[PDB]
Design a protein around this motif. Structure first.
Motif, PDB file in Angstrom:
ATOM      1  N   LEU A  74     -27.121  12.695 -31.844  1.00 56.55           N
ATOM      2  CA  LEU A  74     -28.217  13.791 -32.456  1.00 56.55           C
ATOM      3  C   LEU A  74     -28.481  15.238 -31.291  1.00 56.55           C
ATOM      4  O   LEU A  74     -29.270  15.655 -31.475  1.00 56.55           O
ATOM      5  N   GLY A  75     -27.726  15.047 -30.208  1.00 58.16           N
ATOM      6  CA  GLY A  75     -27.799  16.374 -29.486  1.00 58.16           C
ATOM      7  C   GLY A  75     -28.881  15.958 -28.134  1.00 58.16           C
ATOM      8  O   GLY A  75     -28.569  16.845 -27.390  1.00 58.16           O
ATOM      9  N   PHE A  76     -29.358  14.646 -28.158  1.00 53.35           N
ATOM     10  CA  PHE A  76     -30.312  14.382 -26.934  1.00 53.35           C
ATOM     11  C   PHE A  76     -29.214  13.751 -26.059  1.00 53.35           C
ATOM     12  O   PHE A  76     -29.475  12.557 -25.883  1.00 53.35           O
ATOM     13  N   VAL A  77     -28.726  14.455 -25.054  1.00 55.00           N
ATOM     14  CA  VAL A  77     -27.714  13.845 -23.909  1.00 55.00           C
ATOM     15  C   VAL A  77     -28.435  13.012 -22.806  1.00 55.00           C
ATOM     16  O   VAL A  77     -28.219  12.078 -22.427  1.00 55.00           O
ATOM     17  N   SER A  78     -29.391  13.826 -22.392  1.00 56.86           N
ATOM     18  CA  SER A  78     -30.368  13.501 -21.341  1.00 56.86           C
ATOM     19  C   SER A  78     -30.654  12.061 -21.318  1.00 56.86           C
ATOM     20  O   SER A  78     -31.374  11.944 -22.516  1.00 56.86           O
ATOM     21  N   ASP A  79     -30.859  11.352 -20.583  1.00 56.98           N
ATOM     22  CA  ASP A  79     -31.447   9.832 -20.571  1.00 56.98           C
ATOM     23  C   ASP A  79     -33.149  10.191 -20.556  1.00 56.98           C
ATOM     24  O   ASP A  79     -33.844   9.441 -21.339  1.00 56.98           O
ATOM     25  N   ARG A  80     -33.502  11.202 -19.879  1.00 51.94           N
ATOM     26  CA  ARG A  80     -34.940  11.118 -19.887  1.00 51.94           C
ATOM     27  C   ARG A  80     -35.318  11.700 -21.292  1.00 51.94           C
ATOM     28  O   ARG A  80     -36.616  11.121 -21.782  1.00 51.94           O
ATOM     29  N   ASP A  81     -34.756  12.415 -22.041  1.00 46.78           N
ATOM     30  CA  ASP A  81     -35.070  12.754 -23.015  1.00 46.78           C
ATOM     31  C   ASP A  81     -35.048  11.837 -24.306  1.00 46.78           C
ATOM     32  O   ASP A  81     -36.120  11.563 -25.066  1.00 46.78           O
ATOM     33  N   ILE A  82     -34.066  11.009 -24.192  1.00 46.13           N
ATOM     34  CA  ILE A  82     -33.859   9.913 -25.364  1.00 46.13           C
ATOM     35  C   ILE A  82     -35.025   8.997 -24.889  1.00 46.13           C
ATOM     36  O   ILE A  82     -35.743   8.429 -25.874  1.00 46.13           O
ATOM     37  N   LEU A  83     -35.571   8.676 -23.623  1.00 50.51           N
ATOM     38  CA  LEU A  83     -36.525   7.815 -23.514  1.00 50.51           C
ATOM     39  C   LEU A  83     -37.937   8.361 -23.811  1.00 50.51           C
ATOM     40  O   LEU A  83     -38.880   7.735 -24.155  1.00 50.51           O
ATOM     41  N   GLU A  84     -38.030   9.852 -23.564  1.00 51.90           N
ATOM     42  CA  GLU A  84     -39.232  10.614 -24.176  1.00 51.90           C
ATOM     43  C   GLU A  84     -39.535  10.336 -25.726  1.00 51.90           C
ATOM     44  O   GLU A  84     -40.525  10.025 -26.019  1.00 51.90           O
ATOM     45  N   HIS A  85     -38.209  10.352 -26.672  1.00 50.34           N
ATOM     46  CA  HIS A  85     -38.701  10.197 -27.836  1.00 50.34           C
ATOM     47  C   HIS A  85     -38.607   8.474 -28.190  1.00 50.34           C
ATOM     48  O   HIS A  85     -39.412   8.156 -28.887  1.00 50.34           O
ATOM     49  N   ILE A  86     -38.253   7.593 -27.169  1.00 52.10           N
ATOM     50  CA  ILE A  86     -38.416   6.277 -27.596  1.00 52.10           C
ATOM     51  C   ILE A  86     -39.750   5.579 -26.988  1.00 52.10           C
ATOM     52  O   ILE A  86     -40.392   4.891 -27.630  1.00 52.10           O
ATOM     53  N   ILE A  87     -39.890   5.996 -25.716  1.00 50.59           N
ATOM     54  CA  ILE A  87     -40.983   5.465 -24.993  1.00 50.59           C
ATOM     55  C   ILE A  87     -41.950   6.633 -24.847  1.00 50.59           C
ATOM     56  O   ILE A  87     -41.812   7.382 -23.888  1.00 50.59           O
ATOM     57  N   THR A 126     -33.896  16.827 -34.711  1.00 48.20           N
ATOM     58  CA  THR A 126     -35.180  16.735 -33.985  1.00 48.20           C
ATOM     59  C   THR A 126     -36.091  15.772 -34.841  1.00 48.20           C
ATOM     60  O   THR A 126     -36.426  14.624 -33.822  1.00 48.20           O
ATOM     61  N   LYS A 127     -36.300  15.898 -35.928  1.00 50.16           N
ATOM     62  CA  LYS A 127     -37.070  15.086 -36.582  1.00 50.16           C
ATOM     63  C   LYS A 127     -36.489  13.575 -36.770  1.00 50.16           C
ATOM     64  O   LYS A 127     -37.317  12.594 -36.580  1.00 50.16           O
ATOM     65  N   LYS A 128     -35.257  13.558 -37.046  1.00 50.11           N
ATOM     66  CA  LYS A 128     -34.460  12.306 -37.018  1.00 50.11           C
ATOM     67  C   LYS A 128     -34.459  11.406 -35.773  1.00 50.11           C
ATOM     68  O   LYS A 128     -34.604  10.429 -35.707  1.00 50.11           O
ATOM     69  N   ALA A 129     -34.561  12.149 -34.600  1.00 46.58           N
ATOM     70  CA  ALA A 129     -34.507  11.488 -33.326  1.00 46.58           C
ATOM     71  C   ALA A 129     -35.820  11.153 -32.892  1.00 46.58           C
ATOM     72  O   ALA A 129     -36.109  10.014 -32.602  1.00 46.58           O
ATOM     73  N   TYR A 130     -36.921  11.880 -33.270  1.00 45.35           N
ATOM     74  CA  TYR A 130     -38.145  11.447 -33.397  1.00 45.35           C
ATOM     75  C   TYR A 130     -38.687  10.206 -34.253  1.00 45.35           C
ATOM     76  O   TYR A 130     -38.887   9.139 -33.666  1.00 45.35           O
ATOM     77  N   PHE A 131     -37.988   9.988 -35.377  1.00 44.45           N
ATOM     78  CA  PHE A 131     -38.124   9.035 -36.219  1.00 44.45           C
ATOM     79  C   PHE A 131     -37.574   7.642 -35.650  1.00 44.45           C
ATOM     80  O   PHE A 131     -37.711   6.650 -35.914  1.00 44.45           O
ATOM     81  N   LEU A 132     -36.122   7.796 -35.217  1.00 45.17           N
ATOM     82  CA  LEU A 132     -35.477   6.816 -34.669  1.00 45.17           C
ATOM     83  C   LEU A 132     -36.098   6.278 -33.455  1.00 45.17           C
ATOM     84  O   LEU A 132     -35.916   5.163 -33.068  1.00 45.17           O
ATOM     85  N   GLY A 133     -36.452   7.180 -32.631  1.00 42.76           N
ATOM     86  CA  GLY A 133     -37.363   6.577 -31.221  1.00 42.76           C
ATOM     87  C   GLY A 133     -38.487   5.822 -31.901  1.00 42.76           C
ATOM     88  O   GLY A 133     -38.770   5.006 -31.249  1.00 42.76           O
ATOM     89  N   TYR A 134     -39.098   6.247 -32.893  1.00 46.63           N
ATOM     90  CA  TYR A 134     -40.169   5.497 -33.317  1.00 46.63           C
ATOM     91  C   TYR A 134     -39.850   4.190 -33.835  1.00 46.63           C
ATOM     92  O   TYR A 134     -40.671   3.008 -33.701  1.00 46.63           O
TER      93      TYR A 134
END
Ligand SMILES: [Zn+2]
Ligand SMILES: [Zn+2]
Lengths: 138, 48, 48, 8, 114, 244, 103, 426, 192
Positions: H261-274, H344-352
């Motif tokens: 979904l375009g979010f390569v950095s681990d910090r951003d992925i964890l921002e969406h997840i955690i 971005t919306k899909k990334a936020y919902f998948l992180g949710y």
């Protein structure tokens, strides 16, 4: 002094048309974007199809600097509008509509694993050996 | 009262929450009967 | 069974397969009879 | 419907 | 104890022993960034996982009509009489029927367990 | 029906007031075929656009900068799915939404709005399948229904006052199962709302009448609370077979 | 100096700009004429330890809008323009964000 | 201004008013009514405009080679229920006569169809066939489109219908049929369940659908694999989170999905997840899944990883990447968004979804109950007939396309009236 | 359900138990074993409790309060303040440090309540771990009088010095990853 009770009121101007369209460039706070090192930059439409409805690629300081990717905001502002107020010598605020919103995210200037080698490595999911040494080998 | 105890008798009449809880118990009994028939029939056929 | 201070004569398991592998086919005959009798007579019902 | 030891 | 991220690519650092100086480091695998370890502890696991659920209890919970409240236990900070109490409300809480208390009245949100 | 699991058939607690407890078929379909309660209504569906517009007007900043932040921004506003942003003040938003539900501007009577105070989520569901029931509204310890409403309804014909006027007044409200999870109910006004040894002093709704928990066939059973529960199921089944 | 070069002079001068979210009725009122060069007046009143921002609608246009500020420390924003002559430029950095609410 | 101990009269006065306005079958009726109007228009609007041109290989030259035919279905109309006799004269059909003669109580459905033809001479011609008859829809009795609607009991008696008859049924081939409301699990809702015998300790499912416009459901799973499996690295890493995305043969690591979904950095992925980085327990929970996806550090590589596991392989690499991207944009989380920058919306919902799985694993939230009727929806006559009409209208467009393509390859002409097969819908 | 609770042990009864017996299923739903005691242990409750402890499976996880991994560069450094005393004692006459010492330290802390309930001994646990794993894992155990029951585990001394391995000087599973694997193995598979 006057600063404790100063009242400033300025005229607002909205020109009908502007030669240059106005957009929003938003950087994430954690990226720590700094413009002092931005000696040169190149903003252009992407070529990932290898125009007006495609994302933007920014390359700061050529290849040596950081690259950013910007994507237009998917959610349209059908019930909202954004304006920018800029100081001018006449002392009146000028409002310009936001044509587009872009969120730029950086890509590290680090060595990138090739797709074939990445697939070969993923074949060995149970990497008992240190991954850092594997990255050093590549 | 909250977890299901019915202090009223049938003659006295169950209060609404007691009525619903009693319906839950009766439903469980009915389900047990209906599920029991088939398993016991299969066992009986196997034995014979 | 082989643990110290455990009665080898009377220690028994409900698992008939373990009774088989450990104590033999006759022991299973008796153990299976005991288990079936227990499940049948727990209700108090008697089967000859 | 009676108790835990009885019937439902 | 916690996880820290690289300052260049914002990836996850990994602990690495410095063989020369015998000092713990955190190195990013995708670049050459390195930072010395200040905490000196890496992997902590609490098997009993005894955690004060007061950290997991939200003050907003004081606004729920469906919760029980008593005037017997006053708050420590403001001495408010109303206090809304509730059990763990958590799975895998071991066995705990302890009542946690949240102070009613705006913005206090003090939580005590008795 | 073939599945012998006794989980899907059992009368769940959430069936209260929306599916008849007594009326179920007996056989392979015990507890799998159900019947609506008398006052139960099923949502027909609505467009979520006006609700989203109201939320955008109030606050609900979307595309924010990791503002949840241990849910410092209290609650995340959901709609029929679709996390649409979050708000800093959840209680003011919930109260404004309830007022709008009364005024019937953006919220039809069917629009269901659930705030989970712990876990900090507001769900706002309007998805054409929810089963809801009418409940009277209790403000403080007093029912909003008063003698004026009852007197006007008593003169119903040639007074042009109906149930829809009762809903528009804000006296009654439709609540679905999700909102039933977040609502303190009183079976009766007099017995429960009135001051006594205080069980609850935060009743938010009151049942119109308990007997409405039964369906059509169980409603003919006289004194159903004095019979054993399976007997009411039997009477539902047999009343579907009576000659008339 | 090339076609893709970004004129970062605004960033060098550190020009500060304000971003405001305004409703559709206000924007449509502005767009009705949109060519008279005037839509209203922005009045900011500062006190010893509190500042308030308001916008007054033009009397001709109508035939009070308080502003609520928002913190900008959580995100860095900049404004850039694409000139019709294919000369991209940067106007400034956003130093404050505001929202306009109906009275 | 209160009504105390007079309540027994008041409750039954308000219940009387409730049942006077509505009645018992208002579910069925209302559902059907809504369906017809809204659903039919929506479906007719939502179906893609028919695009059509003659094959270039068939005819030499390019002067008339692309005769583009575009068919758009403008608007819907329903007449009152009508019977067409053998002579052909339309007559109003009363329900009782439909029962007696074994007929079907149905109403004709007319669609305005606009045919725009581009002959490559830039002279596009638009011809509007108004009120084109496409089928007959059975009418639920005493609904807004039934003839019995709005008739007083005397008028109902004149038509030999009972005043007391509830309605809410269809007369098909002279028999009264009742659509039985069908229970289903709620859509666009994240539910975390635990399966004892599964290889996953916990699974979070979202039966996402885009307003039921198409694709009844597009379910996506985010499940944390159990730590029961024992291995050296398996014991070291612990539980890992995988995603059972739709239209993918096997499991995909969740961090790989986030990077796709375009979010390569681990910090951003964890921002969406955690959402709270300060909590250590959740970060420790997420760490092994980051370890699993350490290989793929680019969006294109992640898309290729997804495409390789796609149900139908793509011979070309970039073909696989494009296939994965389009599959994510359409199939995965359709309710959140289906096009453009909904990533971005899909990334936020998948992180949710991942975050809720983490909360369930840590015990901070309780597992969802499948039997909780908040998690259930009831498909009445409306949704069921809407699904039926979606299917049959798509088939009708397909048959129109087939007939049109034959006549267009000939180049003679095309007729909308002949293409439409009323048999299909009816 | 509705089975009378003579003891705190559930038993399959009724149709499902008849199914299990008739099918001779390899996996009973509730496999149980009734054990009768031969000697005076039957009469005396304490000896019966001893037999119960000898017959009940106990993993290291059951008695472990919390586990941590600290990078300790020197044994004398004693990054944890508490161990500084007892480590010193063990290093007053150091044993098995001649080869080397591991730079990583697994400082397991055991709950005293579980230890005394199962009547386990720190020497008993240390012997089980050290003997089963071998000379590779070296364990330092606290005195029971100390408030905290602490077991300090370190990886192989000869493996740390690498003179014993010879071969190629290449780290296998690093050291902290190997220590985490060891921790998981001890948690679920110690069988104390
Ligand atoms: Zn890095
Ligand atoms: Zn307080």
């Amino acid at each position: 002094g006057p600063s404790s009770q100063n009242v400033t009121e300025y005229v607002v101007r909205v020109p009908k048309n502007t030669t240059k369209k106005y957009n929003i460039m938003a950087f994430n706070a954690a990226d720590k974007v700094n413009f002092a090192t931005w000696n040169q930059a190149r903003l252009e439409r992407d070529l990932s199809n290898k125009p007006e409805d495609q994302p933007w690629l920014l390359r700061v300081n050529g290849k040596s600097g950081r690259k950013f990717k910007g994507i237009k905001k998917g959610g349209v502002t059908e019930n909202t509008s954004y304006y920018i107020f800029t100081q001018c010598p006449d002392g009146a605020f000028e409002a310009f509509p936001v044509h587009n919103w872009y969120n730029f995210t950086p890509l590290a200037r680090h060595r990138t694993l090739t797709a074939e080698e990445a697939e070969e490595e993923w074949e060995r999911r149970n990497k008992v050996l240190n991954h850092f040494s594997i990255m050093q080998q590549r | 009262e909250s977890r299901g105890f019915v202090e009223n008798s049938y003659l006295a009449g169950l209060t609404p929450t007691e009525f619903f809880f009693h319906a839950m118990g009766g439903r469980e009994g009915l389900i047990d009967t209906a599920v029991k028939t088939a398993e016991t029939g299969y066992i009986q056929r196997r034995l014979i | 069974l082989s643990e110290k201070d455990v009665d080898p004569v009377r220690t028994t398991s409900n698992d008939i397969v373990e009774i088989f592998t450990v104590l033999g086919i006759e022991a299973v005959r008796k153990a299976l009879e005991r288990e079936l009798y227990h499940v049948i007579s727990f209700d108090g019902s008697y089967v000859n | 419907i009676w108790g835990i030891g009885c019937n439902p | 104890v916690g996880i820290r991220f690289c300052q260049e690519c914002n990836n996850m650092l990994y602990p690495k022993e410095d063989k020369e100086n015998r000092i713990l480091l955190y190195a990013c695998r995708n670049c050459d960034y390195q930072q010395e370890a200040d905490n000196s502890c890496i992997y902590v696991n609490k098997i009993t996982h005894e955690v004060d659920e007061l950290t997991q209890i939200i003050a907003d919970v004081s606004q729920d009509p469906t919760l029980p409240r008593t005037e017997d236990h006053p708050c420590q900070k403001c001495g408010h009489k109303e206090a809304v109490f509730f059990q763990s409300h958590s799975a895998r809480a071991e066995d705990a029927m302890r009542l946690y208390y949240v102070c009613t009245a705006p913005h206090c949100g003090h939580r005590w367990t008795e | 029906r073939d599945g012998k699991l006794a989980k899907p058939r059992q009368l769940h607690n959430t069936l209260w007031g929306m599916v008849c407890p007594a009326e179920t078929p007996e056989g392979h379909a015990v507890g799998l075929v159900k019947n609506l309660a008398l006052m139960a209504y099923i949502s027909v569906g609505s467009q979520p656009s006006p609700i989203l517009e109201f939320l955008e007007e109030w606050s609900m900043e979307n595309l924010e900068e990791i503002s949840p932040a241990a849910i410092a921004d209290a609650t995340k506003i959901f709609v029929n799915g679709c996390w649409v942003g979050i708000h800093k003040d959840p209680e003011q938003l919930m109260n404004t939404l309830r007022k709008l539900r009364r005024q019937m501007d953006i919220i039809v009577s069917e629009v269901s709005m659930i705030r989970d105070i712990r876990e900090r989520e507001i769900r706002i569901y309007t998805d054409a399948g929810r089963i809801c029931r009418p409940l009277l509204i209790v403000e403080k310890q007093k029912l909003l229904l008063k003698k004026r409403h009852i007197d006007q309804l008593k003169e119903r014909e040639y007074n042009n006052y109906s149930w829809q006027d009762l809903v528009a007044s804000g006296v009654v409200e439709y609540i679905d199962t999700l909102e039933e999870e977040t609502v303190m109910l009183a079976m009766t006004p007099d017995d429960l709302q009135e001051k006594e040894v205080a069980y609850c002093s935060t009743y938010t709704h009151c049942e119109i009448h308990p007997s409405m928990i039964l369906g059509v066939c169980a409603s003919i059973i006289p004194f159903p609370d004095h019979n054993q529960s399976p007997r009411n199921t039997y009477q539902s089944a047999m009343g579907k077979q009576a000659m008339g | 100096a090339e076609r893709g070069e970004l004129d970062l002079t605004g960033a060098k001068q550190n020009t500060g700009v304000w971003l405001v979210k305004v409703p559709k009725y206000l924007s449509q009122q502005w767009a009705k004429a949109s060519g008279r060069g005037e839509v209203g007046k922005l009045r900011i009143a500062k006190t010893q330890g509190r500042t308030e921002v308001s916008f007054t609608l033009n009397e001709d246009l109508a035939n009070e809008h308080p502003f609520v500020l928002q913190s900008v420390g959580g995100q860095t924003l900049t404004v850039f323009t694409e000139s019709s002559s294919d000369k991209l430029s940067l106007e400034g950095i956003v130093v404050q964000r505001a929202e306009c609410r109906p009275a | 201004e209160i009504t105390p101990d007079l309540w027994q009269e008041a409750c039954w006065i308000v219940i009387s008013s409730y049942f006077d306005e509505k009645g018992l079958v208002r579910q069925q009726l209302d559902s059907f009514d809504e369906f017809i109007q809204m659903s039919v228009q929506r479906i007719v609007e939502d179906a893609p405009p028919i695009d059509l041109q003659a094959e270039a290989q068939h005819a030499s030259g390019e002067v008339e080679e692309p005769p583009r035919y575009l068919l758009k279905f403008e608007q819907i109309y329903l007449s009152k229920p009508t019977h067409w006799e053998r002579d052909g004269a339309p007559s109003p059909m009363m329900p009782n006569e439909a029962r007696l003669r074994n007929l079907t109580y149905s109403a004709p459905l007319y669609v305005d169809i606009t045919k725009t033809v581009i002959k490559e001479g830039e002279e596009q011609l638009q011809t509007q066939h108004q009120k084109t008859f496409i089928g007959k829809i059975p009418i639920m009795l005493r609904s807004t489109y039934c003839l019995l609607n709005g008739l007083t009991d005397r008028d109902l008696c004149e038509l030999n219908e009972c005043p007391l008859d509830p309605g809410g049924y269809f007369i098909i081939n002279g028999s009264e049929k009742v659509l039985i409301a069908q229970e289903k699990m709620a859509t666009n809702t994240v539910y975390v369940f635990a399966k004892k015998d599964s290889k996953y300790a916990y699974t979070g499912e979202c039966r996402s659908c885009l307003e039921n416009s198409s694709r009844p459901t597009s379910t996506i799973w985010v499940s944390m694999l159990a730590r029961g499996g024992q291995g050296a690295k398996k014991s070291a890493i612990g539980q890992r989170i995988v995603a059972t995305l739709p239209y993918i043969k096997q499991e995909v690591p969740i961090i790989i999905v986030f990077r796709a979904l375009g979010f390569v950095s681990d910090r951003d992925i964890l921002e969406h997840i955690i959402y709270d980085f300060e909590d250590p327990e959740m970060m420790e929970m997420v760490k092994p899944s980051l370890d699993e996806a350490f290989v793929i550090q680019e969006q294109n590589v992640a898309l290729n990883f997804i495409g390789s596991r796609g149900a139908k392989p793509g011979v070309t690499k970039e073909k696989r990447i494009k296939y994965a991207k389009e599959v994510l944009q359409k199939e995965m989380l359709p309710h959140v968004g289906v096009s453009d920058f909904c990533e971005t919306k899909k990334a936020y919902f998948l992180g949710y979804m991942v975050h809720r799985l983490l909360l369930a694993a840590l015990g901070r939230r309780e597992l969802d109950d499948r039997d909780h009727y908040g998690n259930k929806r009831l498909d009445l006559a409306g949704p069921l007939l809407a699904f039926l009409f979606r299917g049959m209208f798509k088939n009708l467009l397909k048959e129109v396309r087939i007939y049109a393509q034959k006549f267009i390859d000939r180049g003679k002409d095309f007729n909308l009236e002949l293409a439409i097969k009323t048999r299909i819908i009816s | 359900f509705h089975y009378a609770g003579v003891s705190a042990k559930n038993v399959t009864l009724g149709v499902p138990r008849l199914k299990e017996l008739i099918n001779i299923s390899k996996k009973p739903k509730t496999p149980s074993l009734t054990v009768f005691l031969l000697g005076q242990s039957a009469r005396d409750a304490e000896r019966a409790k001893d037999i119960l402890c000898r017959l009940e499976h106990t993993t290291l996880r059951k008695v472990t309060a919390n586990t941590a991994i600290y990078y300790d560069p020197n044994p004398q450094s004693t990054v944890v303040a508490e161990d500084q005393e007892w480590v010193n004692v063990y290093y007053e006459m150091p044993d098995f440090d001649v080869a080397r010492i591991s730079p990583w330290l697994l400082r397991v802390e055991l709950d005293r309540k579980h230890m005394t309930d199962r009547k386990l001994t720190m020497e008993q646990i240390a012997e089980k771990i050290n003997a089963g794993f071998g000379d590779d894992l070296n364990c330092i155990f606290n005195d029971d009088n100390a408030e905290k029951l602490v077991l300090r585990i370190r990886i192989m001394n000869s493996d740390e010095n690498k003179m014993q391995e010879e071969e190629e000087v290449v780290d296998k599973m690093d050291d902290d990853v190997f220590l985490r694997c060891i921790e998981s193995n001890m948690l679920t598979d110690m069988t104390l």
